[PDB]
Enzyme design. Sequence first.
Site, mmCIF file in Angstrom:
data_model
loop_
_atom_site.group_PDB
_atom_site.id
_atom_site.type_symbol
_atom_site.label_atom_id
_atom_site.label_comp_id
_atom_site.label_asym_id
_atom_site.label_seq_id
_atom_site.Cartn_x
_atom_site.Cartn_y
_atom_site.Cartn_z
ATOM 1 N N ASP A 130 0.816 -1.221 0.000
ATOM 2 C CA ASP A 130 0.000 0.000 0.000
ATOM 3 C C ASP A 130 0.853 1.276 0.000
ATOM 4 O O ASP A 130 0.701 2.153 0.845
ATOM 5 C CB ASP A 130 -0.972 -0.010 1.189
ATOM 6 N N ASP A 157 -6.277 -10.177 5.327
ATOM 7 C CA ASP A 157 -7.466 -10.956 4.985
ATOM 8 C C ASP A 157 -8.749 -10.240 5.389
ATOM 9 O O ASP A 157 -9.706 -10.189 4.617
ATOM 10 C CB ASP A 157 -7.435 -12.332 5.664
HETATM 11 N N1 LIG Z 1 1.403 8.662 12.295
HETATM 12 C C1 LIG Z 1 0.733 9.677 11.704
HETATM 13 N N2 LIG Z 1 1.111 10.948 11.881
HETATM 14 C C2 LIG Z 1 0.465 11.979 11.305
HETATM 15 N N3 LIG Z 1 -0.607 11.813 10.511
HETATM 16 C C3 LIG Z 1 -1.097 10.595 10.246
HETATM 17 C C4 LIG Z 1 -0.445 9.420 10.839
HETATM 18 N N4 LIG Z 1 -1.124 8.352 10.416
HETATM 19 C C5 LIG Z 1 -2.129 8.785 9.618
HETATM 20 N N5 LIG Z 1 -2.110 10.127 9.521
HETATM 21 C C6 LIG Z 1 -3.054 10.960 8.739
HETATM 22 O O1 LIG Z 1 -4.352 10.370 8.775
HETATM 23 C C7 LIG Z 1 -4.874 10.207 7.456
HETATM 24 C C8 LIG Z 1 -5.680 8.914 7.380
HETATM 25 O O2 LIG Z 1 -4.839 7.767 7.360
HETATM 26 P P1 LIG Z 1 -5.425 6.326 6.972
HETATM 27 O O3 LIG Z 1 -4.287 5.352 6.875
HETATM 28 O O4 LIG Z 1 -6.548 6.032 7.920
HETATM 29 O O5 LIG Z 1 -6.052 6.518 5.501
HETATM 30 P P2 LIG Z 1 -5.215 7.036 4.227
HETATM 31 O O6 LIG Z 1 -3.914 6.285 4.148
HETATM 32 O O7 LIG Z 1 -5.190 8.535 4.244
HETATM 33 O O8 LIG Z 1 -6.124 6.626 2.968
HETATM 34 P P3 LIG Z 1 -6.628 5.140 2.639
HETATM 35 O O9 LIG Z 1 -7.746 4.881 3.589
HETATM 36 O O10 LIG Z 1 -7.093 5.273 1.216
HETATM 37 O O11 LIG Z 1 -5.439 4.232 2.798
HETATM 38 C C9 LIG Z 1 -3.687 10.299 6.501
HETATM 39 O O12 LIG Z 1 -4.023 10.989 5.307
HETATM 40 C C10 LIG Z 1 -2.625 11.045 7.284
HETATM 41 O O13 LIG Z 1 -2.556 12.404 6.879
HETATM 42 O O1 LIG Z 2 -3.528 0.760 8.713
HETATM 43 C C1 LIG Z 2 -3.154 0.114 7.748
HETATM 44 N N1 LIG Z 2 -3.307 0.567 6.505
HETATM 45 O O2 LIG Z 2 -4.243 1.628 6.256
HETATM 46 C C2 LIG Z 2 -5.491 1.372 5.614
HETATM 47 C C3 LIG Z 2 -6.637 1.465 6.618
HETATM 48 O O3 LIG Z 2 -6.491 2.612 7.466
HETATM 49 C C4 LIG Z 2 -7.956 1.562 5.862
HETATM 50 O O4 LIG Z 2 -8.088 2.876 5.311
HETATM 51 C C5 LIG Z 2 -2.558 -1.243 7.996
HETATM 52 C C6 LIG Z 2 -2.800 -2.249 7.056
HETATM 53 C C7 LIG Z 2 -2.302 -3.543 7.206
HETATM 54 BR BR1 LIG Z 2 -2.681 -4.841 5.882
HETATM 55 C C8 LIG Z 2 -1.487 -3.930 8.389
HETATM 56 F F1 LIG Z 2 -1.011 -5.201 8.448
HETATM 57 C C9 LIG Z 2 -1.208 -2.896 9.435
HETATM 58 F F2 LIG Z 2 -0.506 -3.167 10.565
HETATM 59 C C10 LIG Z 2 -1.748 -1.522 9.231
HETATM 60 N N2 LIG Z 2 -1.485 -0.551 10.157
HETATM 61 C C11 LIG Z 2 -0.218 -0.059 10.423
HETATM 62 C C12 LIG Z 2 0.984 -0.659 10.024
HETATM 63 C C13 LIG Z 2 2.224 -0.096 10.359
HETATM 64 C C14 LIG Z 2 2.340 1.082 11.105
HETATM 65 I I1 LIG Z 2 4.241 1.876 11.565
HETATM 66 C C15 LIG Z 2 1.173 1.718 11.524
HETATM 67 C C16 LIG Z 2 -0.085 1.191 11.215
HETATM 68 F F3 LIG Z 2 -1.202 1.809 11.627
#
Ligand SMILES: Nc1ncnc2c1ncn2[C@@H]1O[C@H](COP(=O)(O)OP(=O)(O)OP(=O)(O)O)[C@@H](O)[C@H]1O
Ligand SMILES: O=C(NOC[C@@H](O)CO)c1cc(Br)c(F)c(F)c1Nc1ccc(I)cc1F
Lengths: 289, 289
Positions: A130, A157
């Site tokens: 991703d 999954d």
């Molecule tokens: N560790 C972090 N520090 C700062 N901002 C964060 C962090 N993790 C996520 N974000 C913010 O939160 C938003 C949402 O993240 P999330 O992974 O839920 O979805 P996404 O990656 O934006 O899109 P998608 O759901 O299509 O994967 C991101 O666009 C990012 O700007």
């Molecule tokens: O959070 C994950 N990906 O983002 C998509 C979702 O928010 C739906 O929008 C994520 C996906 C998988 Br597959 C996985 F195995 C994970 F552990 C995820 N989370 C994740 C992984 C690494 C770290 I550093 C932080 C995180 F939040």
Amino acid sequence: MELKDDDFEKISELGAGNGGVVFKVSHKPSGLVMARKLIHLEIKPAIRNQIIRELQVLHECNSPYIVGFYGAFYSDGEISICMEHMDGGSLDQVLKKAGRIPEQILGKVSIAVIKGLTYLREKHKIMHRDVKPSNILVNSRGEIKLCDFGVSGQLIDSMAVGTRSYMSPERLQGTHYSVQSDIWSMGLSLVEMAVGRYPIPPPDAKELELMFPPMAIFELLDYIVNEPPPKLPSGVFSLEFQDFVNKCLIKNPAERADLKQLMVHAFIKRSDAEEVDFAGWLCSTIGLN
Amino acid sequence: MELKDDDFEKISELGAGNGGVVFKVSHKPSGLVMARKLIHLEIKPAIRNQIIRELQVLHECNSPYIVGFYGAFYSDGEISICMEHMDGGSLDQVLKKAGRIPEQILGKVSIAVIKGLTYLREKHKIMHRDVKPSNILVNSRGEIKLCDFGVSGQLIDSMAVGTRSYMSPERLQGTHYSVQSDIWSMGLSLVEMAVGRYPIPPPDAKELELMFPPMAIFELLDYIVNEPPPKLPSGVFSLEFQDFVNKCLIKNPAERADLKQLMVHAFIKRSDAEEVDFAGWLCSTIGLN
Ligand SMILES: Nc1ncnc2c1ncn2[C@@H]1O[C@H](COP(=O)(O)OP(=O)(O)OP(=O)(O)O)[C@@H](O)[C@H]1O
Ligand SMILES: O=C(NOC[C@@H](O)CO)c1cc(Br)c(F)c(F)c1Nc1ccc(I)cc1F
Ligand SMILES: Nc1ncnc2c1ncn2[C@@H]1O[C@H](COP(=O)(O)OP(=O)(O)OP(=O)(O)O)[C@@H](O)[C@H]1O
Ligand SMILES: O=C(NOC[C@@H](O)CO)c1cc(Br)c(F)c(F)c1Nc1ccc(I)cc1F
Ligand SMILES: [Mg+2]
Ligand SMILES: [Mg+2]
């Protein structure tokens, strides 16, 4: 320290996408500011324990190109992943405020992504699954890190889209994909950030003069697999950067470059040497420090 | 009465899908049990007022084949749609517990869907845009109603997938679609509920003996538009029902039947006359009354 639901306090909202939001939070016992992703899953109590168990490998994922991990737990209805708060936000956010991102800046970004993917493959034997602008975080120290990668097989999954695909042609067509799929995703992300908008479909000759409706679901995915891949517009970008993304966007994954070859590419070699104040440019465009 | 955030109390969780959950709730001032869908939208304060304004037409959507509406409001981060609580749940849930749904029961379901779509088109000049088993609710009184239709144009914009498509071929390929797209969605839903699983790809000859991996994203959508549509297996289903879904699943939307023609189809005429205790069969399979 073991992280726990009642030891937290919501500060603000960092963002959202295709599911649960992530909050800026305060771990009260440590006073540490963190980011707390909540993933709601309508799932049995047996396999949700397996997901937390597989998420413990994120503790051993220590790298400057990887977003920090504090711990994971099941609160009530939703699992929780706690991570380093990146005050610069994701690269899709900084692309909005900046319009375009300079080629020189995307050089330093490419170095961070290649080294992050390299760390996950060699040390932990896993792929990202991703890679996109939203899963590349940046901060005021100038750091560029990767989040949201596939460490838990059971979580992959349980979550198996959006109208913007960064998936490789081979992943879209079937199960015949692996680590090379990440390269395609990186290449398409770099073309997006360079040009100012999502590269598919490509801009016509007249649209490129302005810079320098949305497609249907099947229309978009048919372009990715059948129509030729997106090139970078010549003239305003260097020949090295043009060849770099060209190697990343070769439809055939075996013909396409891997992390080994891209590390020694002319674009990366030049970008390593360059004097680029990434921390200053980041704070200038989003307004922080 | 005007609905308000602080006048509510969470009872339980009715379910979730591709976004925010919906709770069984208690409107304290009236004592009425309701279902409360929360749609989180990272959206400006101007257009979110337009969404609530356009959602007020649901008050005027009174029909026995349409799920009741109490009101909508913006709480804090997420808009709220409050509706009649249907204790039987959605038809995707009852399909899981039942394995298959009898042809006779799907007759009564087809009558409810046609009359619900007919009500929306004639009285309110709008299409559903999202007909599938999860958006068809049932209850212990024997009622079969439709929810989650497109009343607000601004909300359609703000939410524009999942690995299971009920979208018609024409909607998948482009913008050249309208009310006929709903017919395809109904037909595919009826084949799913009759056979016990999602109809694409179709079961081979050997799989049909047992009853009587998952596809990639592009693989699935390429089957819908290019490969011939899903038929119903002969023998165990009547010729009338086989012709009914056949008319609903004609790739060409102009060639495909509309609500007018399907209302006077042999399958619907027979199903109207039939003595079917839908309330008894529903409570028997899910266990309620
Ligand atoms: N560790 C972090 N520090 C700062 N901002 C964060 C962090 N993790 C996520 N974000 C913010 O939160 C938003 C949402 O993240 P999330 O992974 O839920 O979805 P996404 O990656 O934006 O899109 P998608 O759901 O299509 O994967 C991101 O666009 C990012 O700007
Ligand atoms: O959070 C994950 N990906 O983002 C998509 C979702 O928010 C739906 O929008 C994520 C996906 C998988 Br597959 C996985 F195995 C994970 F552990 C995820 N989370 C994740 C992984 C690494 C770290 I550093 C932080 C995180 F939040
Ligand atoms: N008024 C209601 N009464 C009873 N149950 C409901 C009601 N509304 C929704 N539900 C339940 O909540 C679940 C989630 O509904 P929601 O519309 O959020 O997603 P969905 O339609 O299931 O799937 P998708 O997100 O793919 O459209 C449904 O499966 C349904 O069982
Ligand atoms: O809620 C709607 N559809 O469900 C999908 C989401 O839950 C994401 O999973 C919905 C969609 C549109 Br477009 C719209 F205009 C609406 F008003 C919706 N809600 C809705 C519509 C009618 C009724 I009765 C109840 C409802 F909750
Ligand atoms: Mg993310
Ligand atoms: Mg629904």
